[PDB]
Amino acid sequence: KLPPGWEKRMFANGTVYYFNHITNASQFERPSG
């Protein structure tokens, strides 16, 4: 699936990104490890 704590997320305008629930980090390209 994804690295530790990362999951898919989405803006109110319909734009998709990735979010870490453990570390509160956020990024647009798919996380890797």
Side-chain angles (χ1 to χ4, degrees):
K1 180 177 175 180
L2 277 166
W6 292 89
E7 191 156 48
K8 282 177 69 178
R9 211 70 170 104
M10 188 192 291
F11 289 109
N13 62 26
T15 304
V16 171
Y17 67 106
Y18 302 86
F19 178 73
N20 195 306
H21 90 83
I22 304 177
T23 81
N24 216 111
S26 57
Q27 75 175 56
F28 287 97
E29 183 172 359
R30 197 217 72 197
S32 299

mmCIF file of all heavy atoms in Angstrom:
data_model
loop_
_atom_site.group_PDB
_atom_site.id
_atom_site.type_symbol
_atom_site.label_atom_id
_atom_site.label_comp_id
_atom_site.label_asym_id
_atom_site.label_seq_id
_atom_site.Cartn_x
_atom_site.Cartn_y
_atom_site.Cartn_z
ATOM 1 N N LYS A 1 0.842 -1.226 0.000
ATOM 2 C CA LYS A 1 0.000 0.000 0.000
ATOM 3 C C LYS A 1 0.868 1.265 0.000
ATOM 4 O O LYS A 1 1.148 1.804 -1.072
ATOM 5 C CB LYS A 1 -1.070 -0.046 1.118
ATOM 6 C CG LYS A 1 -1.990 1.190 1.176
ATOM 7 C CD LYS A 1 -3.054 1.019 2.271
ATOM 8 C CE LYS A 1 -3.891 2.293 2.434
ATOM 9 N NZ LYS A 1 -4.926 2.125 3.485
ATOM 10 N N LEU A 2 1.317 1.729 1.173
ATOM 11 C CA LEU A 2 2.071 2.975 1.399
ATOM 12 C C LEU A 2 3.054 2.812 2.590
ATOM 13 O O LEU A 2 2.895 1.867 3.376
ATOM 14 C CB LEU A 2 1.069 4.122 1.674
ATOM 15 C CG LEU A 2 0.458 4.779 0.420
ATOM 16 C CD1 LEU A 2 -0.743 5.640 0.799
ATOM 17 C CD2 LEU A 2 1.461 5.690 -0.288
ATOM 18 N N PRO A 3 4.051 3.706 2.761
ATOM 19 C CA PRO A 3 4.953 3.706 3.918
ATOM 20 C C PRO A 3 4.228 4.037 5.245
ATOM 21 O O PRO A 3 3.085 4.509 5.217
ATOM 22 C CB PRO A 3 6.053 4.736 3.610
ATOM 23 C CG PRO A 3 5.860 5.106 2.144
ATOM 24 C CD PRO A 3 4.392 4.804 1.872
ATOM 25 N N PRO A 4 4.872 3.842 6.415
ATOM 26 C CA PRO A 4 4.245 4.009 7.729
ATOM 27 C C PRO A 4 3.539 5.362 7.932
ATOM 28 O O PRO A 4 4.139 6.433 7.805
ATOM 29 C CB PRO A 4 5.363 3.785 8.754
ATOM 30 C CG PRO A 4 6.292 2.814 8.028
ATOM 31 C CD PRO A 4 6.216 3.296 6.581
ATOM 32 N N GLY A 5 2.246 5.298 8.261
ATOM 33 C CA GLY A 5 1.377 6.447 8.541
ATOM 34 C C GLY A 5 0.771 7.153 7.320
ATOM 35 O O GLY A 5 -0.211 7.877 7.487
ATOM 36 N N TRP A 6 1.297 6.955 6.106
ATOM 37 C CA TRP A 6 0.778 7.586 4.884
ATOM 38 C C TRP A 6 -0.548 6.985 4.386
ATOM 39 O O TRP A 6 -0.716 5.763 4.347
ATOM 40 C CB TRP A 6 1.826 7.567 3.766
ATOM 41 C CG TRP A 6 3.043 8.418 3.969
ATOM 42 C CD1 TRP A 6 4.172 8.006 4.586
ATOM 43 C CD2 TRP A 6 3.201 9.864 3.793
ATOM 44 N NE1 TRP A 6 5.061 9.055 4.697
ATOM 45 C CE2 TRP A 6 4.501 10.233 4.256
ATOM 46 C CE3 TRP A 6 2.391 10.900 3.272
ATOM 47 C CZ2 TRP A 6 4.964 11.554 4.232
ATOM 48 C CZ3 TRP A 6 2.861 12.230 3.215
ATOM 49 C CH2 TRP A 6 4.140 12.558 3.696
ATOM 50 N N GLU A 7 -1.468 7.840 3.931
ATOM 51 C CA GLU A 7 -2.714 7.471 3.243
ATOM 52 C C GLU A 7 -3.163 8.583 2.268
ATOM 53 O O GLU A 7 -2.788 9.749 2.429
ATOM 54 C CB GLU A 7 -3.800 7.132 4.282
ATOM 55 C CG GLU A 7 -5.041 6.483 3.649
ATOM 56 C CD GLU A 7 -5.846 5.637 4.652
ATOM 57 O OE1 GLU A 7 -6.131 6.106 5.781
ATOM 58 O OE2 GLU A 7 -6.202 4.484 4.303
ATOM 59 N N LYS A 8 -3.964 8.243 1.248
ATOM 60 C CA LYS A 8 -4.571 9.223 0.327
ATOM 61 C C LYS A 8 -5.516 10.211 1.022
ATOM 62 O O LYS A 8 -6.230 9.864 1.966
ATOM 63 C CB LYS A 8 -5.261 8.537 -0.863
ATOM 64 C CG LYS A 8 -4.221 8.079 -1.894
ATOM 65 C CD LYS A 8 -4.831 7.325 -3.083
ATOM 66 C CE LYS A 8 -5.661 8.251 -3.981
ATOM 67 N NZ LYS A 8 -6.216 7.519 -5.150
ATOM 68 N N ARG A 9 -5.515 11.443 0.517
ATOM 69 C CA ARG A 9 -6.237 12.620 1.031
ATOM 70 C C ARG A 9 -6.749 13.466 -0.147
ATOM 71 O O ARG A 9 -6.306 13.279 -1.284
ATOM 72 C CB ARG A 9 -5.257 13.403 1.933
ATOM 73 C CG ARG A 9 -5.906 14.172 3.094
ATOM 74 C CD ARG A 9 -6.465 13.239 4.176
ATOM 75 N NE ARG A 9 -6.870 13.998 5.376
ATOM 76 C CZ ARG A 9 -8.094 14.311 5.766
ATOM 77 N NH1 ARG A 9 -9.156 14.021 5.065
ATOM 78 N NH2 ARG A 9 -8.280 14.939 6.890
ATOM 79 N N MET A 10 -7.671 14.399 0.098
ATOM 80 C CA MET A 10 -8.305 15.190 -0.968
ATOM 81 C C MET A 10 -8.820 16.550 -0.467
ATOM 82 O O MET A 10 -9.457 16.646 0.586
ATOM 83 C CB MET A 10 -9.444 14.372 -1.612
ATOM 84 C CG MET A 10 -10.045 15.039 -2.860
ATOM 85 S SD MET A 10 -11.596 14.305 -3.457
ATOM 86 C CE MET A 10 -11.018 12.701 -4.075
ATOM 87 N N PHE A 11 -8.537 17.596 -1.242
ATOM 88 C CA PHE A 11 -9.025 18.966 -1.062
ATOM 89 C C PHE A 11 -10.511 19.197 -1.386
ATOM 90 O O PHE A 11 -11.100 18.457 -2.179
ATOM 91 C CB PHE A 11 -8.109 19.941 -1.820
ATOM 92 C CG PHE A 11 -6.735 20.128 -1.204
ATOM 93 C CD1 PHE A 11 -5.590 19.607 -1.841
ATOM 94 C CD2 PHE A 11 -6.601 20.831 0.009
ATOM 95 C CE1 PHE A 11 -4.321 19.790 -1.261
ATOM 96 C CE2 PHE A 11 -5.331 21.011 0.587
ATOM 97 C CZ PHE A 11 -4.191 20.490 -0.048
ATOM 98 N N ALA A 12 -11.111 20.264 -0.846
ATOM 99 C CA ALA A 12 -12.513 20.630 -1.103
ATOM 100 C C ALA A 12 -12.816 20.947 -2.588
ATOM 101 O O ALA A 12 -13.961 20.828 -3.030
ATOM 102 C CB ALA A 12 -12.858 21.820 -0.200
ATOM 103 N N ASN A 13 -11.792 21.321 -3.369
ATOM 104 C CA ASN A 13 -11.864 21.539 -4.821
ATOM 105 C C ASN A 13 -11.787 20.244 -5.672
ATOM 106 O O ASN A 13 -11.881 20.315 -6.901
ATOM 107 C CB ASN A 13 -10.780 22.563 -5.222
ATOM 108 C CG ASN A 13 -9.355 22.113 -4.927
ATOM 109 O OD1 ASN A 13 -9.070 20.920 -4.865
ATOM 110 N ND2 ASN A 13 -8.442 23.059 -4.786
ATOM 111 N N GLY A 14 -11.602 19.071 -5.050
ATOM 112 C CA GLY A 14 -11.471 17.774 -5.729
ATOM 113 C C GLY A 14 -10.038 17.379 -6.131
ATOM 114 O O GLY A 14 -9.870 16.512 -6.992
ATOM 115 N N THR A 15 -9.006 17.974 -5.520
ATOM 116 C CA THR A 15 -7.585 17.665 -5.797
ATOM 117 C C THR A 15 -7.042 16.627 -4.814
ATOM 118 O O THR A 15 -7.174 16.801 -3.604
ATOM 119 C CB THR A 15 -6.705 18.927 -5.713
ATOM 120 O OG1 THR A 15 -7.175 19.930 -6.584
ATOM 121 C CG2 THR A 15 -5.238 18.647 -6.035
ATOM 122 N N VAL A 16 -6.394 15.570 -5.314
ATOM 123 C CA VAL A 16 -5.883 14.445 -4.505
ATOM 124 C C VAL A 16 -4.410 14.678 -4.149
ATOM 125 O O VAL A 16 -3.625 15.184 -4.956
ATOM 126 C CB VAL A 16 -6.050 13.113 -5.271
ATOM 127 C CG1 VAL A 16 -5.354 11.911 -4.615
ATOM 128 C CG2 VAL A 16 -7.537 12.753 -5.390
ATOM 129 N N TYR A 17 -4.039 14.274 -2.934
ATOM 130 C CA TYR A 17 -2.675 14.291 -2.395
ATOM 131 C C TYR A 17 -2.535 13.156 -1.358
ATOM 132 O O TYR A 17 -3.422 12.309 -1.215
ATOM 133 C CB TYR A 17 -2.387 15.683 -1.794
ATOM 134 C CG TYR A 17 -3.178 16.090 -0.560
ATOM 135 C CD1 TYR A 17 -2.549 16.113 0.702
ATOM 136 C CD2 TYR A 17 -4.512 16.532 -0.684
ATOM 137 C CE1 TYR A 17 -3.242 16.589 1.832
ATOM 138 C CE2 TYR A 17 -5.205 17.013 0.444
ATOM 139 C CZ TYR A 17 -4.567 17.055 1.703
ATOM 140 O OH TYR A 17 -5.223 17.548 2.787
ATOM 141 N N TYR A 18 -1.409 13.109 -0.648
ATOM 142 C CA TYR A 18 -1.083 12.094 0.358
ATOM 143 C C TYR A 18 -0.774 12.752 1.706
ATOM 144 O O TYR A 18 -0.142 13.810 1.762
ATOM 145 C CB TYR A 18 0.089 11.232 -0.136
ATOM 146 C CG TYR A 18 -0.182 10.531 -1.456
ATOM 147 C CD1 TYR A 18 0.062 11.208 -2.668
ATOM 148 C CD2 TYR A 18 -0.679 9.214 -1.476
ATOM 149 C CE1 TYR A 18 -0.229 10.592 -3.899
ATOM 150 C CE2 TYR A 18 -0.944 8.582 -2.707
ATOM 151 C CZ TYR A 18 -0.737 9.275 -3.921
ATOM 152 O OH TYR A 18 -1.022 8.668 -5.104
ATOM 153 N N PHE A 19 -1.211 12.122 2.796
ATOM 154 C CA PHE A 19 -1.127 12.647 4.158
ATOM 155 C C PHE A 19 -0.657 11.593 5.165
ATOM 156 O O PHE A 19 -1.144 10.461 5.145
ATOM 157 C CB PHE A 19 -2.483 13.248 4.552
ATOM 158 C CG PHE A 19 -2.511 13.772 5.971
ATOM 159 C CD1 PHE A 19 -1.818 14.959 6.252
ATOM 160 C CD2 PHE A 19 -3.164 13.078 7.011
ATOM 161 C CE1 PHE A 19 -1.762 15.456 7.561
ATOM 162 C CE2 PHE A 19 -3.132 13.592 8.320
ATOM 163 C CZ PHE A 19 -2.428 14.780 8.598
ATOM 164 N N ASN A 20 0.272 11.951 6.054
ATOM 165 C CA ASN A 20 0.752 11.070 7.114
ATOM 166 C C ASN A 20 0.000 11.344 8.428
ATOM 167 O O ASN A 20 0.135 12.417 9.018
ATOM 168 C CB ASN A 20 2.269 11.237 7.260
ATOM 169 C CG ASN A 20 2.849 10.092 8.070
ATOM 170 O OD1 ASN A 20 2.420 9.810 9.180
ATOM 171 N ND2 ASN A 20 3.830 9.399 7.549
ATOM 172 N N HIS A 21 -0.766 10.364 8.916
ATOM 173 C CA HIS A 21 -1.579 10.511 10.133
ATOM 174 C C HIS A 21 -0.746 10.511 11.430
ATOM 175 O O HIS A 21 -1.178 11.071 12.440
ATOM 176 C CB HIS A 21 -2.682 9.437 10.138
ATOM 177 C CG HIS A 21 -2.319 8.119 10.791
ATOM 178 N ND1 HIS A 21 -2.376 7.855 12.165
ATOM 179 C CD2 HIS A 21 -2.005 6.961 10.141
ATOM 180 C CE1 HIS A 21 -2.073 6.554 12.309
ATOM 181 N NE2 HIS A 21 -1.842 5.993 11.110
ATOM 182 N N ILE A 22 0.456 9.920 11.405
ATOM 183 C CA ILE A 22 1.371 9.794 12.551
ATOM 184 C C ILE A 22 2.231 11.058 12.713
ATOM 185 O O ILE A 22 2.455 11.528 13.832
ATOM 186 C CB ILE A 22 2.264 8.538 12.361
ATOM 187 C CG1 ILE A 22 1.398 7.268 12.160
ATOM 188 C CG2 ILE A 22 3.221 8.356 13.551
ATOM 189 C CD1 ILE A 22 2.183 5.982 11.883
ATOM 190 N N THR A 23 2.695 11.619 11.592
ATOM 191 C CA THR A 23 3.674 12.724 11.521
ATOM 192 C C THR A 23 3.131 14.083 11.066
ATOM 193 O O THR A 23 3.847 15.088 11.128
ATOM 194 C CB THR A 23 4.926 12.310 10.727
ATOM 195 O OG1 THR A 23 4.663 12.409 9.348
ATOM 196 C CG2 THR A 23 5.412 10.878 10.976
ATOM 197 N N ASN A 24 1.865 14.135 10.637
ATOM 198 C CA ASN A 24 1.160 15.308 10.098
ATOM 199 C C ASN A 24 1.812 15.903 8.820
ATOM 200 O O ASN A 24 1.511 17.036 8.434
ATOM 201 C CB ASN A 24 0.924 16.331 11.234
ATOM 202 C CG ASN A 24 -0.406 17.060 11.117
ATOM 203 O OD1 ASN A 24 -1.320 16.873 11.911
ATOM 204 N ND2 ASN A 24 -0.558 17.934 10.149
ATOM 205 N N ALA A 25 2.697 15.157 8.148
ATOM 206 C CA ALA A 25 3.271 15.530 6.854
ATOM 207 C C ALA A 25 2.244 15.409 5.706
ATOM 208 O O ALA A 25 1.308 14.609 5.776
ATOM 209 C CB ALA A 25 4.509 14.659 6.605
ATOM 210 N N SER A 26 2.434 16.176 4.628
ATOM 211 C CA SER A 26 1.565 16.185 3.435
ATOM 212 C C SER A 26 2.375 16.382 2.146
ATOM 213 O O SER A 26 3.282 17.220 2.120
ATOM 214 C CB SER A 26 0.484 17.270 3.549
ATOM 215 O OG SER A 26 1.041 18.564 3.749
ATOM 216 N N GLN A 27 2.051 15.652 1.071
ATOM 217 C CA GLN A 27 2.772 15.737 -0.211
ATOM 218 C C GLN A 27 1.905 15.317 -1.415
ATOM 219 O O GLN A 27 0.966 14.534 -1.270
ATOM 220 C CB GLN A 27 4.075 14.917 -0.117
ATOM 221 C CG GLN A 27 3.919 13.391 -0.182
ATOM 222 C CD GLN A 27 5.284 12.706 -0.204
ATOM 223 O OE1 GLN A 27 6.129 12.887 0.666
ATOM 224 N NE2 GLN A 27 5.569 11.911 -1.211
ATOM 225 N N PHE A 28 2.220 15.828 -2.611
ATOM 226 C CA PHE A 28 1.457 15.573 -3.846
ATOM 227 C C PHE A 28 1.795 14.308 -4.655
ATOM 228 O O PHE A 28 0.903 13.667 -5.214
ATOM 229 C CB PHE A 28 1.432 16.833 -4.724
ATOM 230 C CG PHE A 28 0.536 17.942 -4.199
ATOM 231 C CD1 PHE A 28 1.089 18.992 -3.439
ATOM 232 C CD2 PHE A 28 -0.846 17.932 -4.471
ATOM 233 C CE1 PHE A 28 0.268 20.028 -2.960
ATOM 234 C CE2 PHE A 28 -1.666 18.972 -3.995
ATOM 235 C CZ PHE A 28 -1.110 20.020 -3.239
ATOM 236 N N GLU A 29 3.077 13.942 -4.719
ATOM 237 C CA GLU A 29 3.566 12.704 -5.354
ATOM 238 C C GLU A 29 3.444 11.508 -4.392
ATOM 239 O O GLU A 29 3.557 11.685 -3.177
ATOM 240 C CB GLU A 29 5.014 12.933 -5.826
ATOM 241 C CG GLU A 29 5.620 11.733 -6.573
ATOM 242 C CD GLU A 29 6.998 12.022 -7.214
ATOM 243 O OE1 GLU A 29 7.524 13.158 -7.123
ATOM 244 O OE2 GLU A 29 7.574 11.089 -7.828
ATOM 245 N N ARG A 30 3.231 10.283 -4.899
ATOM 246 C CA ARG A 30 3.021 9.095 -4.049
ATOM 247 C C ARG A 30 4.239 8.822 -3.132
ATOM 248 O O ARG A 30 5.352 8.672 -3.648
ATOM 249 C CB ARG A 30 2.690 7.861 -4.906
ATOM 250 C CG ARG A 30 2.062 6.742 -4.051
ATOM 251 C CD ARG A 30 2.499 5.340 -4.477
ATOM 252 N NE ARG A 30 3.904 5.085 -4.102
ATOM 253 C CZ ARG A 30 4.682 4.127 -4.572
ATOM 254 N NH1 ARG A 30 4.250 3.227 -5.411
ATOM 255 N NH2 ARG A 30 5.927 4.048 -4.207
ATOM 256 N N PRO A 31 4.058 8.712 -1.799
ATOM 257 C CA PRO A 31 5.119 8.374 -0.848
ATOM 258 C C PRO A 31 5.796 7.031 -1.147
ATOM 259 O O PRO A 31 5.196 6.136 -1.751
ATOM 260 C CB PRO A 31 4.459 8.380 0.535
ATOM 261 C CG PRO A 31 3.281 9.333 0.364
ATOM 262 C CD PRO A 31 2.853 9.075 -1.075
ATOM 263 N N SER A 32 7.053 6.890 -0.721
ATOM 264 C CA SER A 32 7.910 5.723 -0.987
ATOM 265 C C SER A 32 8.873 5.437 0.175
ATOM 266 O O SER A 32 9.237 6.345 0.930
ATOM 267 C CB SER A 32 8.716 5.934 -2.278
ATOM 268 O OG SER A 32 7.858 6.097 -3.396
ATOM 269 N N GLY A 33 9.297 4.174 0.316
ATOM 270 C CA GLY A 33 10.191 3.694 1.384
ATOM 271 C C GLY A 33 10.629 2.244 1.186
ATOM 272 O O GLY A 33 9.747 1.356 1.157
#
